[PDB]
Design an enzyme around this catalytic site. Structure first.
Site, PDB file in Angstrom:
ATOM      1  N   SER A  79      25.019  63.703 -39.311  1.00  0.00           N
ATOM      2  CA  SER A  79      23.587  63.851 -39.286  1.00  0.00           C
ATOM      3  C   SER A  79      23.121  64.351 -37.937  1.00  0.00           C
ATOM      4  CB  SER A  79      23.085  62.219 -39.147  1.00  0.00           C
ATOM      5  OG  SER A  79      21.946  62.311 -39.681  1.00  0.00           O
ATOM      6  N   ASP A 132      20.991  62.307 -51.269  1.00  0.00           N
ATOM      7  CA  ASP A 132      20.571  61.733 -50.024  1.00  0.00           C
ATOM      8  C   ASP A 132      19.179  61.647 -49.684  1.00  0.00           C
ATOM      9  OD1 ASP A 132      20.563  61.150 -47.209  1.00  0.00           O
ATOM     10  OD2 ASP A 132      22.370  62.459 -46.799  1.00  0.00           O
ATOM     11  N   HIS A 164      23.662  58.591 -47.395  1.00  0.00           N
ATOM     12  CA  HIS A 164      23.724  59.643 -46.051  1.00  0.00           C
ATOM     13  C   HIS A 164      24.764  59.149 -45.185  1.00  0.00           C
ATOM     14  CE1 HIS A 164      21.837  62.101 -43.085  1.00  0.00           C
ATOM     15  NE2 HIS A 164      22.009  61.091 -42.155  1.00  0.00           N
TER      16      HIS A 164
END
Length: 266
Positions: free
Chosen positions: A96, A218, A247
């Site tokens: 991320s 996602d 995610h």
């Protein structure tokens, strides 16, 4: 040593084996790699784990909001860790928001990175002309409002949507527990910068090879974002799409993520 304690730095594997550094996303910590690390060690890699400043496992009583008002403070933290560990070269796996941290760090010290692996990373979450990042400003405004008003209720809803399928029936609670351990204002200010960031123009500056990995579904990273990074990162790129939804697939579906991560590192 205070720098390494401050970030909960953990080094596993043989001292002489190739180094892999693993960064985590917003709301989690290095425990997101709980199901990935033993495979890396048994594959004869030396694994460096660390927590970004502001994580719940990090001490934040006098959190430096100015230093961490952009990713520059986190990039400087990551660079200081690599030097303190005397790492001359490494593979960096960024989950991320740690994906952009690794990209930005590689722009400042490309010698330090053999290879970037971006897991569920995005250079921009807001939509734009012919760019679909998945979010409009009204979604972000409502997202931030819900974070300030009722952080626990927001975490529960966001964690269920971000985790996706939870077949072993534990990742939602796991992700929720690390998120709720954060200071809500640290989470808010980090989210406000990250969700509204735009690193698209510096992508062409990247020179190190980049493996782009993300789930097929996602809620925070449309598949179009992986194709975009493939075409806009300045160096060698490749895309591996995981046959999952979520995610944090290394936490919720590690059996489908670990083989892909092993291939990318080697």
């Amino acid at each position: 040593s205070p720098l390494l304690s401050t970030h909960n730095v953990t080094v596993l594997g043989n001292r002489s084996d190739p180094v892999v550094v693993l960064g985590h996303g917003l709301g989690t910590d290095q425990s997101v790699w709980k199901y990935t690390v033993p495979s890396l060690v048994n594959q004869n890699f030396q694994v460096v784990l660390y927590d970004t400043m502001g994580a719940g496992s990090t001490e934040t009583s006098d959190f430096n909001f100015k230093r961490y008002s952009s990713l520059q403070g986190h990039v400087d933290d990551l660079l200081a860790i690599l030097d303190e560990l005397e790492i001359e070269n490494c593979v960096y796996v960024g989950h991320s928001m740690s994906g952009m941290i690794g990209v930005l760090a590689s722009l400042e010290r490309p010698d330090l990175f053999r290879k970037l692996i971006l897991l569920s990373a995005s250079p921009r979450y807001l939509n734009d002309s012919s760019y679909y990042g998945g979010f409009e400003q009204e979604d972000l405004d409502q997202l931030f409002s819900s974070m300030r008003s009722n952080f626990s209720a927001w975490v529960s809803g966001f964690a269920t949507a971000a985790v996706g399928t939870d077949i072993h029936d534990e990742a939602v609670q796991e992700f929720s527990s690390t998120f709720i351990s954060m200071r809500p204002d640290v989470a808010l200010r980090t989210s406000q910068f990250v969700f509204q960031s735009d690193f698209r123009s510096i992508l062409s500056e990247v020179t190190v090879p980049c493996h782009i990995v993300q789930s097929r579904k996602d809620i925070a990273v449309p598949i179009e974002v992986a194709e975009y990074l493939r075409c806009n990162l300045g160096g060698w790129t490749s895309v591996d799409i995981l046959q999952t939804d979520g995610h944090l697939p290394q936490l919720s579906c590690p059996e489908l993520v670990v083989p892909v991560l092993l291939h990318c590192i080697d």
